[PDB]
Design a binder for these strands. Structure first.
Lengths: 132, 180, 730, 62, 730
RNA sequence: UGCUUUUAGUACGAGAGGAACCAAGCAGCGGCGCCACUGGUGUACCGGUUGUCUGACAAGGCAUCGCCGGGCAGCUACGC
C-alpha cells in the first residue's frame, strides 16, 4: 500500500473486540486476521492504525452479526509518532467497515479518525466528520 | 431461534428477566410504552416500535399500534417470502418472538354510576391483533402470551436453540385462547 | 469573470477586512420605498450579473420582504462599493423600521453598527420615525438621514430650490433635536448628522436620483440644480449621474461610521454579560478573537441549504466543522455553511474571520435570539428562555353559517402563519378557542383572520383560564380500589419554587441520568431519598415514588402514573389544568394476582387520592402576569404609573432615559385589558405600551372565592364542589 | 514549526517531544509530559493543581 | 446579454431553423476515442465556459460512460460552429453502439442524421467499427471519417510523414472497400468519404488537434508541418492553429445532412407505412405541424424534475402542453415541459419544430420502442413490442462460505442494476435462482458479479422455464367441496392464440369497461357469449363464467377465482405456471348459506376440478424460442445454417447483404445452449450473434415425456405421472 | 520476501481482460546497534492517606515499598 508519514505500532492483535463506529449496524467486531500481514512462529496477527483486518461482527444488528467482513482501524490507544516528532494517542480504539479497496460500508463516521487512515484511504476521510 | 422480540405486555410481571435473557442471547428487544420504560430503567437496551412501523405514539398502555400490510410478515411464517417479507419492509424488523398479554377487562361500579365510558374505553385493540397475527405463525414466530411461561421458553432457547414445533404449537394455541 | 464571479473571489478574503467592512442598517418610516432603495443599493445596482441581481427583488435573504417602503424583518446581503478607488464591503443589513418588533429588534440592531434614516420630502419625522430613532439610540447605531423622493415637494408641490432644501435643513435639525433631547451625550459621539458635513443625503429611491453636499459638490450638480432638473422632469437621467445606490454607499464608506468605531458601542448596553472576556474585547474594540462569537439573530433556513441563523461576525472567525454551542443548550453541530450574505442571497463559504456577517447553519434546535458560539457563552446578549403559552383566549364564532367551511380552512391554516396562536379549535359546537393571553393577542389575530382570508366571524370575551395548584403540605390520603382489594397512600404538597422554575425551563428531563437528576433535585432542596424516588413529571408537577417494599409495584407504575397525569389535566377544584404541585406516593397495598390489578381498579384509586390531596392542601389557583413595557413620554409618569398600579399592577422599572419612561410592571393579565383604552385618557393620548407573558403567579387569596365562583359557572359546574369526605367516599 | 502549549501546565511543547491526546468527541489536548498526561487522566484539574499555570492563575485571582 | 444567453436565443432560432440543424453522431470501435472526441469537441467549440466540461464529462451525461474513455449509450449535446460566417445547430447524438447493445443501437441510429467513424490511427478499422458502420448505413446514416490518435503513430511509433499518410490512405481504402460491400447503391450515391472531399479529418481527440484536406489548404498547415509540431512538442500550437472542433464540425455540417434531407431517405428506408399517409409526408419532408412523431430513445429521470424522455422531434411541433399518444402504448397521457438540450443539460424552451431532439416530462406513454404521437395507432418504422420475461434461470450459489452476506446485497442491487432478471432470493437453501431472459444475458450478469463486486461464486446448469398447457376441449368435470355442499361443474380448453397474444399485449384487461374489452375479444375470436361472460385474465389464462341463473354465485366468485389463479400459477403436471388455458364454468351447485361456502371449502373444489381437467386435456409444455440474428460473413453459411437446422433453426430470412450472410432464424431457447460457442468456433471466429425471446411454442411432442420427466426430477417430484384420475377423486 | 505508485489501462487481445525492463516509497520477517523522543520499571526520591506505637504537635518505626499518586538517572521495547 501507499506509505504513511507516521510510524504506527501494530497495537491490536487477533482476538481484540473493537467497537465499530459507523452506521452499518455492527456494534462490536472481533479481529480475525490482518490483511497483507505475514507473521512468524507463535506471533499473533498485529494491526495498527491504517491496517485492514478481517473481522467478525460480534454485536450489532442480526444481519451484520456472524459475518466475516473487512474493517479498517481508525483509532488506537497505543501512541504513534508523527514525522515532526509529536506523539498522538486516542482515547479508545475504533474501526470502520470497508471493502477490499478501502471504501467504507457506512456513510458517516462518529468520532475522530486518524490523519494517517484519512490519507491512505481518502474515502474514509470524506466519510468522517473530523480528521485529527 | 429468536432474533428480535416484540414485548408489548400489558401485564409486565417478570418481563425484566425474559428481556435480560433475550438480550444476553443477542435477541434485539423492539418494545414500546410501559414495557420499554421498565426495560430501559432496568439496564436492558430496547428499541422502540417507532423504529419499525411508521406510527408514533398515543395513549401508550393499550392500542396505539397495529400492523397492516406488514403483519403478513410474521403472520403464519416470518420466513415464507410471500409471508416473510411483509414484516421488515422499510426499517421494519423481522421479529421472531412476540409476547403480548392483555390486562383482564373489568367494569366494576363507581360511587356515582358505572364508569362505562373509561371502563369500556380500555379495550386493547393493538395487543389482541399482534397476538392473533404472531399466533397464526404455527412455525417461525414463537408467541408468548401467558406470562407464566417465560421460564420454559428461556430454558429451551438457552439449551436447544430453537423453540420446538410442539412448544410453538402450545404457545400459539394458548395465545388464541387468551384472545378468545 | 462575470461581476459577482469576481466579487466571490475578493469577498472570500474581504471577510477579515474590518477597515472597509460596512455592516449597517436603515431606520425610518414606511411607505417611502426604503426597502426598495435598499433593494437597489446592491441588487438594483447589479452587484451580481444583471440577470441574476435585483431583477426580481431577490437581494434580501428573507426574499418575502420585497418592498413596502421599509424593512420587513431583518434580512441580509452585501455590496462591495468603490469609493476613492477602494472596494468597501457594505454588508447591507437594513434594520426593521417599526415599533412592535421588540426583544428581537434589539438583536436585529445588534447585527449592524448604524441604522440609516430615509424620509420622503414633507413626510417629516413621523411618530414611527422618532420611535425607530429611539430604538436606534439604544444599540449605538449611528444614523444618516436619506430624505427620499423629494419629488412631491418638487414637481408635484413645486417648492423653490432654496425653500425645498431649507425644509430639509430643518428636518435635519429635528434629527439633531432627536439626538439631543433624547440622548444629549449621544450627539457629539458621531451620532450628529448634517447635510453640509456630508452625514446626510436625499434623493428619490423610485427615480434613483440622490445627492448630499459631498455628492452634490463632487458631481457638480448642486441641490439647486438638481431641483431644476427634477422639476423639469428628467429625474431618471438625474439618477443616471446621481446613482441612488452611490450616494448611500459613498456615505456608508465616508460619513456613515465604519463598523470598527462603534464596534464597541452596542455590546455593553445590548450585551448583558461580561464585556471584558476575549469575546467581549473583540466584539467591542474591533477585533476577531472571541472563540466563534456568533449570535443567532434569527433562526432561518433555505430549501436544500442550511439552518441559516443570521449573525454578523461581530467577533471571531468562521470555518467549516466547528462544534458550536447555543444560548439554550450544548447542541454542537457541524458548521458547514459559514458563508456571507452576498449578491441577492447568502453566498455559502467557510474562511470568514470577524468583520462582515457570519450566518452559521447546521442546526435545528436553537431560538431566534440566541447567540450560538463555540465559546462557553456565560451571558450571551439575549440570554433568555421561551417556555410560555397563552392562557386567556376567546371563542371565535361565525356571524354567518355560510362562512364556516371557509373559517375552517382559515383557522386550521393560521397555525402556519403563527405557531404562537395555539388554536385550540374544538370540533363539536365549534366555540374555536383561538389562542390568546391578553387583549393584544386577541386583536393581534382579529384582523389577520379578517384580512389574510377575510371571514364574517366574531369573538367572545376573554377566557379567564389559569393553572390550578395548591399551597399546603397535606397528610397521607388513602386511595382505595373499586373492587376494595388494593390501596395507595399518597400525600401531596406544594412544588418548591426553585424546582418549579427548574422544570419550567425544562432542564429536568425524564430522558436524563438518574444520579445526575437526583443531585440537581437535592441541590434545589428536596432530600436525598425523596429526590431519588421521582418517577415522572407532567406539565410542572412531579410524582415521587418514596415507597419501600410493596411487591409488584413498578409493573403498575404505568397505571398509577397515568392516573396522576389525568388529574394533572383536570383539577379537582375548578376542573382546570394543575401545575407546580408535587405528589409523593408514601405507601401502597396491591392485590397478589394480576386479575385484580387492571387499569379499571388502579387508575381510579390514584386519581381519587391525588385530587382529594390537592383539595385538602388549600388548593388555590395561579394567574399569568404580563410585563407591560410602556414607553410613555419621559415627562408622563404620574398618570402612566397610576394606571398600572390601580389595575393591581405591581410596579417594576420606570426606565427613564432621555425622553422615554418605559415603566414595566408585569401587569396581571386579570386587569390587563384595555390598556391602550385607558392610556388614551390617562396620559392625554400619549403612551406606547407593549406586553409579554410575565409568568404564572398566585391569584390574590382575597378574591379566590370570586375567581373560582366565576370559573365554575363559566365552564358550567355545580356551585359547590365535592368537599373532601365526599370525593374521598370510602 | 507548530508552537504548542501543554494543556495542563501551560508550557510550550518543545519540538520533537510531547504528546497529543484525542477524546471520542474530537477534543484534542497537548501534553508536555507523562506527568501532565497522568494528572489529566486522574481527573485532577489544572486550576486546582498549584504547580501549573492555571493553578497559579487561580491562586493569584485573590 | 451574456454570451451564453445570446447563444441561448441563437439556440431557439436554430430550433425553428430546421435547415440549419445537424443531428450528427459518433461511431467507432472500443477504445478508439469516442468519449474523448465528444467532450473535447464540446470544449473545442467552447459552447460552454471551458472549465464546465472536461472534469465533469458532459457528453457522458449519464453515469456508466463517465468512467471509460469511450462512448457507451445515448443522450445528446450541442455545438454551434461558425462556418464561412454562419452558425449551425449541431446536435450530438450520444452513441449507444457499444457491442454490448442490440435494439438500443438501432433506436439511436434512428435518430442520428449521420455519424463520424473514428478509426484508431494505429489499430485501424476494427470488427466493432465494421458492425456499427454497416448497421448505421443499413438504417441510412451517412458518416464521415475522423481518424483519431494520429499522435500515437507520429510520436510513439516514430513513423515519418510520408508513411503517416500511406497508413491513413490504407485506412481510407479499407473504409470505403467495406462501405462498398455494405451498400453498392449508396456507394453509387457517393456517401463514401475522402479527405480531399472534406469528409475525412485527421487528428487526436486527446490533444484536441485535428486537420482535414480542405482546412489544411485554407490555413496552409500540411501533414508534414503537423509531423514537425508533433515531433517538436508543438501539439499545443497544433490545437490552436487547427482546432479539433474546427475540422470535425466542418465535416459535421458541410458534408453531413440536416433534419429535412436526412428525414427523407430515412423515412423511405426505415419506415414501412405508406408514405402518402399524412404522418409519412410530414416526417419525410420536414413538417412538425402534423401527427406527433417522438420516438423516446432515453429516459433521463431528472432526480429533481421527474422522468425526462429524450426523443428526436422527427415530426410534431412542441408548443407548450399537448395531450398525445405513442407507438404501441398509445394510451392517454399528456405532454407538459419540453426542454431542449443545451450543453449537456436541459434548457427549458417552448415550441420546438422539426429535427430537434427534445426532452419531455409528464409522459407516461414514453419509453424505448414508443414513438409518442398525437395520431392514435401510429404506423411503425420498425415493428416493436414491449413484453419480455425471465425464461432461463440458474441457481446462483455462494461457494465461498465467507461471501453469502455480500452475495445477498449484490443481487439485491442486481434488480435495478439490470431490470431483466427475477432472483428468487432465499435462505432455506442459499441457492438464489436468478431468472434471466437469455442464457447469454445470464452468463454476462453472473460474470459481472465476480468482476465488479468480485464475489467468489459461480452459477450451476441453466434450466428453461416452461409453461403448462392443455391440448383439447374437455368434458365437464365436477369439482366437489369436502362437505359436498358445493359442486363446480367446470371444463377447460386451449386459449385462442390471438387472444393469448393480445392479453400478453395488455390491452385486454379485467380493469376494462365491458363494452370495450368485449368488442376486442369478440372480433379477435372469443364467441360473443364467452366474451360477455369473462371474469378474469391471468397471464394467458381466463375463467369464463358461462353459467346462468345460479344463486349465490355473484358473491361466491372470489373464492373460485382464487383457486383458479392458484392452479394457474402451478399446473397439476410439471408444477409450472399455466398458459394458454381458458376455463368455462358450466354448473355451480351451491349450498344456501355461507357457513358451507367458506373459502376453505370453495377453494379446494375449484382447484381440484381445474387441475383434473387440465390433465385430462393432454397437458403439454410450451417451450420458448429465441429469435436469432447472426451478423456473419457472406461466405460463412455452410456450417452456420446446418448448425441451426440441426437445432431446429426455422430460418425466417437470410439477408445475404453482399459480403455479409446475416442469417435471421428462430431456434428453441432450450437448444440455444452451446450454439454460442459452435457458431463462432466453426465460422473461424466470424459470427456476431444476437437473440431475443422468440415466443412460447407448443413443445414438439417428440420427447414430451422425456422433457417432463427431466423437470419432475430436477424439481424433485414423483415418478408416477400425475394421473388426472387422482385429482378427480371421489 | 511482499504491497502500492510508475511503466500502463500500454504491449497482447474482437472484446472482456491485461503484462514485462527500469524507477520510487512503504510494509512483513530477520540481523546488528542505540536511548534524543514515547511507553514500562525505577523497593533512589517527593507527596497524600488508613491502622497502630513512640504522651500531644512536629519528626519518626511497622504493616508487601502498608496502600495510593507522581517520578530523575539507569536498564529496556511497545521506541529509534
Amino acid at each position: 500500500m501507499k506509505g504513511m508519514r507516521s510510524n504506527i505500532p501494530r497495537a491490536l492483535n487477533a482476538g481484540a473486540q473493537i467497537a465499530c463506529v459507523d452506521n452499518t449496524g455492527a456494534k462490536v467486531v472481533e479481529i480475525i486476521s490482518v490483511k497483507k500481514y505475514r507473521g512468524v512462529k507463535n506471533r499473533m496477527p498485529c494491526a495498527g492504525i491504517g491496517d485492514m483486518c478481517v473481522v467478525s461482527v460480534k454485536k450489532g444488528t442480526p444481519e451484520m452479526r456472524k459475518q466475516v467482513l473487512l474493517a479498517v482501524v481508525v483509532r488506537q490507544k497505543q501512541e504513534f509518532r508523527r514525522p515532526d516528532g509529536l506523539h498522538v494517542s486516542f482515547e479508545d480504539n475504533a474501526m470502520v467497515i470497508t471493502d477490499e479497496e478501502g471504501i467504507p460500508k457506512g456513510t458517516d463516521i462518529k468520532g475522530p479518525v486518524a490523519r494517517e487512515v484519512a490519507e491512505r484511504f481518502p474515502k474514509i476521510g470524506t466519510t468522517a466528520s473530523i480528521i485529527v | 431461534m429468536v432474533k428480535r422480540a416484540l414485548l408489548s405486555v400489558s401485564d409486565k410481571t417478570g418481563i425484566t428477566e425474559f428481556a435480560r435473557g433475550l438480550e444476553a442471547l443477542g435477541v434485539k428487544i423492539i418494545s414500546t410504552g410501559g414495557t420499554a420504560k421498565i426495560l430501559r430503567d432496568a439496564g436492558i437496551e430496547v428499541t422502540d416500535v417507532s423504529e419499525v412501523t411508521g406510527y408514533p405514539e398515543m395513549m401508550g398502555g393499550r392500542v396505539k399500534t397495529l400492523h397492516p400490510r406488514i403483519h403478513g410478515g410474521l403472520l403464519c411464517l416470518r420466513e415464507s417470502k410471500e409471508q416473510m417479507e411483509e414484516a421488515e419492509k422499510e426499517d421494519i424488523s423481522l421479529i421472531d418472538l412476540v409476547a403480548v398479554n392483555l390486562y383482564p377487562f373489568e367494569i366494576t361500579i363507581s360511587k356515582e354510576g358505572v364508569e362505562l365510558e373509561e371502563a369500556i374505553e380500555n379495550i386493547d385493540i393493538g395487543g389482541p391483533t399482534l397476538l392473533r397475527s404472531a399466533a397464526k405463525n404455527y412455525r417461525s414466530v414463537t408467541v408468548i402470551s401467558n406470562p407464566s411461561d417465560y421460564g420454559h421458553v428461556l430454558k429451551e432457547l438457552r439449551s436447544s436453540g430453537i423453540i420446538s414445533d410442539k412448544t410453538r404449537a402450545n404457545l400459539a394455541v394458548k395465545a388464541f385462547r387468551h384472545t378468545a | 469573470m462575470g461581476r459577482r464571479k469576481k466579487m466571490v473571489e475578493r469577498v472570500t478574503t474581504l471577510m477579515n477586512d474590518p477597515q472597509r467592512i460596512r455592516n449597517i442598517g436603515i431606520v425610518a418610516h414606511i411607505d417611502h420605498g426604503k426597502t426598495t432603495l435598499s433593494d437597489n443599493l446592491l441588487a438594483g445596482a447589479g452587484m451580481i450579473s444583471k440577470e441574476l441581481a435585483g431583477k426580481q427583488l431577490f437581494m434580501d435573504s428573507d426574499e418575502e420582504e420585497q418592498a413596502r417602503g421599509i424593512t420587513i424583518d431583518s434580512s441580509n446581503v452585501s455590496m462591495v462599493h468603490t469609493f476613492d478607488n477602494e472596494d468597501y464591503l457594505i454588508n447591507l443589513i437594513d434594520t426593521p423600521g417599526h415599533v412592535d418588533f421588540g426583544g428581537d429588534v434589539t438583536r436585529a440592531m445588534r447585527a449592524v453598527d448604524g441604522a440609516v434614516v430615509v424620509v420622503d420630502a414633507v413626510e417629516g419625522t413621523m411618530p414611527q420615525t422618532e420611535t425607530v430613532l429611539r430604538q436606534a439610540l439604544r444599540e449605538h447605531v449611528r444614523p444618516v438621514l436619506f430624505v427620499n423622493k423629494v419629488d412631491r415637494l418638487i414637481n408635484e408641490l413645486q417648492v423653490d430650490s432654496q425653500e425645498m432644501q431649507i425644509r430639509l435643513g430643518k428636518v435635519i435639525d429635528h434629527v439633531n433635536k432627536l439626538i439631543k433631547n433624547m440622548n444629549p451625550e449621544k450627539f457629539k459621539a458621531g451620532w450628529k448628522v448634517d447635510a453640509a458635513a456630508g452625514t446626510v443625503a436625499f434623493g428619490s429611491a423610485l427615480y434613483n436620483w440622490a445627492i448630499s453636499v459631498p455628492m452634490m459638490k463632487k458631481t457638480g450638480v448642486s441641490f439647486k440644480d438638481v431641483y431644476d432638473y427634477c422639476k423639469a422632469g428628467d429625474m431618471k437621467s438625474l439618477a443616471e449621474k446621481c446613482p441612488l445606490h452611490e450616494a448611500v454607499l459613498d456615505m456608508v464608506i465616508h460619513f456613515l461610521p465604519n463598523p470598527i468605531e462603534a464596534q464597541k458601542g452596542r455590546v455593553k448596553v445590548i450585551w448583558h454579560g461580561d464585556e471584558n472576556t476575549e469575546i467581549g474585547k473583540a466584539m467591542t474594540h474591533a477585533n476577531a478573537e472571541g472563540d466563534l462569537a456568533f449570535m443567532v439573530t434569527d433562526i432561518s433556513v433555505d430549501p436544500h441549504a442550511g439552518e441559516v441563523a443570521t449573525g454578523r461576525l461581530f467577533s471571531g472567525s468562521l470555518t467549516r466543522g466547528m462544534e458550536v454551542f447555543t444560548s439554550g443548550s450544548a447542541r454542537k453541530s457541524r458548521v458547514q455553511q459559514v458563508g456571507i450574505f452576498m449578491g441577492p442571497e447568502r453566498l455559502e463559504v467557510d474562511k470568514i474571520p470577524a468583520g462582515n456577517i457570519a450566518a452559521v447553519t447546521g442546526l435545528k434546535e436553537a431560538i431566534v435570539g440566541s447567540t450560538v458560539t463555540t465559546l462557553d457563552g456565560m451571558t450571551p446578549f439575549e440570554s433568555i428562555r421561551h417556555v410560555s403559552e397563552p392562557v386567556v383566549t376567546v371563542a371565535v364564532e361565525a356571524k354567518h353559517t355560510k362562512d364556516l367551511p371557509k373559517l375552517i380552512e382559515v383557522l386550521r391554516q393560521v397555525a402556519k402563519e403563527d405557531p404562537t396562536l395555539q388554536i385550540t379549535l374544538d370540533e363539536e359546537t365549534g366555540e374555536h378557542l383561538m389562542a390568546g393571553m391578553g387583549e393584544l393577542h386577541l386583536e393581534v389575530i382579529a384582523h389577520r383572520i379578517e384580512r389574510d382570508k377575510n371571514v364574517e366571524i366574531t369573538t367572545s370575551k376573554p377566557i379567564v383560564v389559569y393553572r390550578e395548584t395548591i399551597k399546603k403540605k397535606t397528610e397521607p390520603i388513602e386511595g382505595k380500589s373499586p373492587n376494595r382489594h388494593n390501596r395507595f397512600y399518597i400525600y401531596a404538597e406544594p412544588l418548591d419554587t426553585e424546582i418549579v422554575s427548574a422544570i419550567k425551563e425544562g432542564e429536568v428531563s425524564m430522558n436524563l441520568p438518574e444520579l445526575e437528576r437526583r443531585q440537581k433535585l437535592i441541590d434545589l432542596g428536596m432530600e436525598k431519598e425523596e429526590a431519588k424516588g421521582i418517577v415522572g413529571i407532567f406539565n410542572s408537577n412531579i410524582f415521587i415514588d418514596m415507597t419501600k417494599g410493596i411487591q409488584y409495584l413498578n409493573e403498575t407504575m404505568e397505571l398509577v402514573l397515568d392516573g396522576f397525569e389525568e388529574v394533572m389535566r383536570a383539577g379537582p377544584l375548578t376542573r382546570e389544568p394543575v401545575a407546580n404541585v408535587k405528589c409523593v406516593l408514601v405507601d401502597a397495598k396491591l392485590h397478589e394476582d394480576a386479575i385484580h390489578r387492571g387499569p379499571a381498579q388502579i387508575i381510579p384509586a390514584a386519581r381519587q387520592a391525588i385530587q382529594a390531596g390537592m383539595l385538602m392542601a388549600e388548593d388555590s389557583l395561579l394567574e399569568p402576569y404580563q410585563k407591560v413595557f410602556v414607553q410613555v413620554p419621559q415627562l408622563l409618569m404620574g398618570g402612566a404609573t397610576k394606571e398600572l398600579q390601580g389595575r393591581r399592577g405591581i410596579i417594576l422599572n420606570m426606565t427613564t432615559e432621555g425622553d422615554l419612561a418605559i415603566i414595566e410592571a408585569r401587569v396581571p393579565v386579570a386587569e390587563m385589558f384595555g390598556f391602550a383604552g385607558e392610556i388614551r385618557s390617562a396620559t392625554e393620548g400619549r403612551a406606547m405600551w407593549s406586553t409579554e407573558f410575565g409568568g404564572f403567579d398566585v391569584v390574590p387569596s382575597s378574591i379566590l372565592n370570586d375567581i373560582v365562583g366565576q370559573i365554575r359557572e363559566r365552564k358550567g359546574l355545580k356551585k359547590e364542589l365535592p368537599k373532601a369526605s365526599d370525593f374521598l367516599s370510602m | 514549526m507548530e508552537q504548542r502549549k501543554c494543556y495542563f501546565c501551560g508550557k510550550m511543547l518543545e519540538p520533537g517531544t510531547g504528546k497529543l491526546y484525542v477524546k471520542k468527541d474530537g477534543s484534542t489536548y497537548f501534553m508536555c509530559s507523562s506527568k501532565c498526561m497522568s494528572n489529566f487522566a486522574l481527573g485532577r484539574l489544572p486550576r486546582r493543581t498549584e504547580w501549573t499555570e492555571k493553578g497559579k492563575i487561580q491562586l493569584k485571582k485573590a
